[PDB]
Design a protein around this ligand. Structure first.
Ligand code: SF4
Ligand code: SF4
Lengths: 532, 532
């Protein structure tokens, strides 16, 4: 009466539907042997370094077809808003710049994540984590990427690791003699939009689930640079299993799962509720960052078994920097997923704001316009994000004044990637505004941060602060870090806190920097209707 | 300049601090060999079946020393409340019954979770998941446990799998030639108290972190049968990594981690913040389920590296059914963690309520007493939990009456384990009340469910309903399922929905069933002060 049923039963477990390229000459890293009558593969662990290096290089300059098709759909759909088409066009042009292999597609070159599946008889010598980490180290050190990892020296004392390590290395033991991989360069902002809900059987009916989806999609907001790949996982054997599943679903790793359940509790994709997620996303009006239809590229919904007392639910997105690559090592060598090298084939007024004026004159000009107005910024921005804000608040709590450089220019929340030789700037797109919300009222009450520039919707405290203090929040397009660096950023200099690395305070000169007035000085917020 | 640093660097990676017993004759399942100059281990996969069967059998009848010591501490501490000592004494006596190897310590025999670490040169034949699942199948089929897994036939249509499968099988590839394991029998209610928070750098200071802990600990409530092993994880490379870490911390799997960080971002335990967590738990007054000092046995706090833009935070507990077992297979055979076989060595005014009356007479008697009154129930209980409530609401939505059996007796939210031969009842302790909160006002408005009996604090809607309709919520002690079955439950009959398995409606005859009045018919709630 015993019947074993694996939870996950993909019809394409080795991902034959994906196109792979062989690393030339890589069959020299492997050797087929036989021990105790069974076939085994000896793998020179230097293959893991080579593979990880190429994976975490390529993934920053090219995209998958299904991601690029979504941007074209947003341009060509008659039901797309004008802002949908504008944002999607910008992202596609950004992808064309990134395809030049110098600038990465986003300044947040992400956390390096490796899902590895080592066959029982795949023999590497066992130092996989070291050799994989060396390849990741190579990719981030020898390319114009960014060191984004923050080490905790104690509970509160932190420093940048300076090399984008440690990686997340999830190496699984599986049958056979091959080594299969999914590499993910996961941005922090989209990682932050991975949510776990602890629900109950009372959720599991059509009316309750639909209302739940409507409520939760809004909480994603625009803070992870939509259009999104939206993944929703209902059920799971534990919270951590639910969240791992929703991550992998967002990477389309589970696309070949069955579409029906059975009495053994196997996982399945639910295309009907995928359609419902897309309808909710489209009718939400949130759009591709600034109102419209293209909140989402596509949706994945995976229904899981559950303990009768339990119903964990995971919701997560893949963002505009949709960065994963499949790979495998076998008797023939090293194979890596082929991404789209020619994104250009998918490619079918505003207010000039002079920032080279007194900030009060800039505030006066912005006050003339409603939320949703598109602006083009020309002049100096002061760049500061999470740690700089915390240090400055800490200074003020010790009686120190708000520094003068926080009062002369708009504050751009951003952290740049490394600058290529001969370039004015590396990739340099915006950070999530909402993480700095707790500082705006304080800084504005001390005569600074009257104008901020970042991406994402903000909390009500920021709307109230801008109305109280005559302030503004400007929304940059989120994601197009390469085209901003190439076309808009003309000069970059470190102004304060150099030891923070990318989180130092910078002074940058920009030209033709596009943004929308998201919050004005009158209590208005262009997200108040769609994200209420 | 490259330096590899593993995130997790336990000083005791193989758990030498744990005592193990070898399965007699199990060296016949293993054979050390040497291939290509390296030491390897051949493992008959039947070893995995034998090991999983014994692990998921033993863990339901015995506990670890640090768990039992916590209950003794709550009994002997002069600062423990009377309710602290009463609950801890009850749980310790329950453990004495479970040690008889017939009744499991809790009716929720949990989800079967396997963390396995297969060495590069540990050769099983590769069918580990099937052979592990067979051993788990054996444990739940041939012992007096419970089938708790719910399969989804489609998004909403569900059935019990009837065998407690599927398991969660997390099998990792690691160096060496051994096979190391952590087996967890995870209750659904404590699995539900695994929470993920998406925080920011603004949290990472002493004042903010302390306030955060005070706020989140209350949201655990009493719904997972405290005293808790409380685990808190600050940081992580992804949501799913944070939640896996907090699970393992709650199992004391990471106890030998370093206690300081470094520039490479290694994980560490923070004993200072473990003490602060314990201080918050004790000063909360929540106590061991019914007010006092012993909200928590102990605390684990792990600080993790993070992407600069990210700060995931995990909070989770191990409950009174604290069930994990370490194991390993090596050249000498199968070794399994030795649990405490003699829990008795740790062992150093109520109102009689006659349920054999019209329910209105029972309500009148209960109305004479304040919340916090300890009560002893004698008579019939009608048993119904999540799916039965959902089915009954569906019937009423179709115009059908609230069933008669929802009106005659107090409703006990519970699902029994299997009945041992010759016993009146299998283990039969209470389910989490809060999951049924959305039905109370509706059912009471239709003349039923005036008295409910379960465990855990409930939402304000239930307090309002009981006051509006003259109802009561009685709190059973959470956890002591074996002693309740042995001493209190005299007769068990299936009443409705037999196809739901443990989730059928039952009619049981009880004697001397202890409970507290948690919500009365006047708007009072004995958790209103401690869980506000
Ligand atoms: S596209 Fe946006 S959310 Fe994604 S990594 Fe870049 S900044 Fe972060
Ligand atoms: S002790 Fe309580 S929380 Fe733990 S498994 Fe049993 S019923 Fe669930």
């Amino acid at each position: 009466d015993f019947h074993f049923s694996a939870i996950f039963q993909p019809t394409d477990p080795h991902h034959h539907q994906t196109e792979f390229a062989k690393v030339e000459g890589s069959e020299k890293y492997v050797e087929e042997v036989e021990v105790f009558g069974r076939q085994a593969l000896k793998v020179n662990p230097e293959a893991l370094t080579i593979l990880a290096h190429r994976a975490f290089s390529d993934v920053h300059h090219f995209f998958r077809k299904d991601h690029l098709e979504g941007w074209r759909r947003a341009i060509e759909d008659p039901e797309a808003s004008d802002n949908d088409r504008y944002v999607a066009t910008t992202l596609l042009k950004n992808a064309c710049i990134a395809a030049g292999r110098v600038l990465p597609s986003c300044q947040d070159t992400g956390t390096a994540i490796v899902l590895g599946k080592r066959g029982e008889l795949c023999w590497t010598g066992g130092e996989d984590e070291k050799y994989l980490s060396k390849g990741i180290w190579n990719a981030y050190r020898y390319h114009n990427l960014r060191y984004s990892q923050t080490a905790a020296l104690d509970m509160f004392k932190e420093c940048n690791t300076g090399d984008n390590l440690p990686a997340q290395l999830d190496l699984l033991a599986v049958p056979g003699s091959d080594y299969e991989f999914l590499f993910i360069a996961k941005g922090g902002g989209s990682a932050n939009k991975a949510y776990l809900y602890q629900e109950t059987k009372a959720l599991l009916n059509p009316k309750s689930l639909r209302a739940f989806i409507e409520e939760k999609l809004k909480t994603l907001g625009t803070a992870a640079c939509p259009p999104y790949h939206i993944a929703l996982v209902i059920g799971g054997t534990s919270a951590e299993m639910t969240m791992k599943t929703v991550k992998l679903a967002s990477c389309r790793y589970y696309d070949s799962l069955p579409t029906t359940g059975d009495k053994y509790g196997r996982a399945f994709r639910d295309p009907e509720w995928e359609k419902i997620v897309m309808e909710v996303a489209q009718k939400s009006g949130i759009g591709a960052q600034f109102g419209g239809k293209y909140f989402a590229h596509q949706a994945r919904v995976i229904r899981l078994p559950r303990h009768g007392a339990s119903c964990p639910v995971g919701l997560a997105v893949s963002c505009s920097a949709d960065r994963q690559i499949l790979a495998h090592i076998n008797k023939s060598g090293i194979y890596i997923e082929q991404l789209e090298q020619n994104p250009a084939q998918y490619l079918p007024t505003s207010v000039k704001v002079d920032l080279k004026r007194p900030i009060d004159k800039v505030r006066q000009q912005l006050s003339q316009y409603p939320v949703g107005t598109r602006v083009m910024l020309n002049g100096t921005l002061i760049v500061a994000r999470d740690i700089a804000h915390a240090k400055i608040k800490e200074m003020m709590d010790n009686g120190e004044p708000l520094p003068e450089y926080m009062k002369t220019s708009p504050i751009y929340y951003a952290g740049p990637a490394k600058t290529p030789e001969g370039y004015a700037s590396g990739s340099f797109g915006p950070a999530t505004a909402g993480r700095m919300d707790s500082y705006v009222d304080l800084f504005q009450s001390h005569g600074g941060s009257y104008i901020t520039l970042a991406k994402g919707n903000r909390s009500k405290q920021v709307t109230d602060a801008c109305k109280k203090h005559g302030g503004f929040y400007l929304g940059s397009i989120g994601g197009p870090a390469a085209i901003l660096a190439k076309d808009s950023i003309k000069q970059v200099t470190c102004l304060a806190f150099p030891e923070l690395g990318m989180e130092a305070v910078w002074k940058i000169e920009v030209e033709d920097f596009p943004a929308f007035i998201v919050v004005d000085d009158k209590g208005n917020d262009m997200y108040s209707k769609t994200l209420a």
